[PDB]
């Protein structure tokens, strides 16, 4: 989805993209939130990797039940 937040307004009337009032629109990307999101996504990724690694040994050891 595309975020619905007040787009940042910077007064640059010389820019061709300035409106009648002259405010060019800059994205609403916050810096701190994105770094926190990157860290959280990395730690969830690694946790799921650890879960798969843990399950894997049990998976391979299940198949020795028959033989």
């Amino acid at each position: 989805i595309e975020s619905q937040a007040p787009e940042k307004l910077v007064y640059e009337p010389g820019n061709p993209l300035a409106d009648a009032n002259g405010y060019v629109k800059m994205p609403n990307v916050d810096v701190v939130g994105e770094m926190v999101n990157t860290m959280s996504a990395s730690r969830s990724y690694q946790a799921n990797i650890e879960v798969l690694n843990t399950v894997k040994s049990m998976m391979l050891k299940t198949l020795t039940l028959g033989q």
Binding site: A5, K8, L9, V10, Y23
Partner: protein, 243 residues
């Protein structure tokens, strides 16, 4: 982030200095009106609280107050007492308006400004002139040898604007009419609101000196504070990047 606000702040203070430096450079200019910068804050973002965006200069207003007179024994220089503008014909063909009363005569008679631009209506001075008289009401008379009466030449008509602050400054001590200062009103000096003329005196600059010194002190301190703001924001971002 908060850098795009202190950037506008710094731009504002440099605009203020460029106005103050312009005022201080034109101290000796005859018929100069001081400029004053006007600042305005930008659009606020509402998410209720209101977050600002910075500052933007609007329009430098010039003060049309009558400056002091200085005496020059030159008979071609005149000064305006009140509001009014001398009309000057540009080389292109449009008319500009000036308050510099330092006039000369060129090789074909005729009164011109300091840069040689002709002064309208055109006032042709004869060669056998002995003394030139520019009167209170703009009557330009000339004395000739033998004649016991002076020969009238012309009228120095002053142009009055409804809003004098809206004139566009060309540069070379000329103001041209704009939309905000339209309908120039020619008049004989002394009637219909126009000012009078003093012959042999030149109007001095309007600029006050102590005000500009205090203004530069304030501008410098505000500029230093805004640079400190930029430094603090940079340091916060540098600390953030290390994460």
């Amino acid at each position: 982030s908060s850098l795009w606000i202190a950037k506008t702040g710094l731009d504002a203070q440099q605009t203020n200095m460029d106005v103050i430096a312009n005022n201080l450079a034109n101290v000796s200019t005859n018929g100069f009106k001081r400029q004053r910068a006007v600042f305005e804050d930008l659009l606020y973002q509402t998410i209720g609280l209101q977050i600002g965006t910075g500052v933007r200069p609007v329009a430098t207003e010039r003060l049309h107050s009558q400056g002091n007179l200085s005496q020059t024994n030159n008979s071609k220089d005149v000064a305006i007492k009140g509001q009014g503008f001398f009309q000057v014909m540009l080389p292109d063909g449009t008319s500009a308006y000036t308050r510099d009363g330092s006039f000369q005569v060129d090789q074909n008679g005729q009164l011109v400004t300091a840069g040689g631009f002709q002064v309208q209506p055109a006032i042709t001075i004869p060669a056998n002139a002995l003394s030139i008289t520019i009167g209170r009401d703009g009557v330009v008379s000339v004395t000739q040898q033998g004649q016991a009466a002076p020969v009238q030449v012309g009228q120095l008509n002053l142009t009055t604007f409804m809003n004098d602050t809206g004139l566009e400054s060309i540069g070379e001590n000329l103001y041209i009419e704009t939309q905000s200062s339209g309908a120039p009103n020619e008049s004989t000096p002394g009637l219909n609101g126009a000012g009078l003329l003093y012959q042999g005196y030149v109007e001095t600059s309007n600029v006050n000196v102590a005000e500009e010194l205090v203004n530069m002190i304030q501008v410098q301190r505000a500029y230093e504070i805004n640079s400190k703001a930029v430094s603090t924001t940079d340091q916060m971002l540098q600390k953030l990047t290390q994460l």
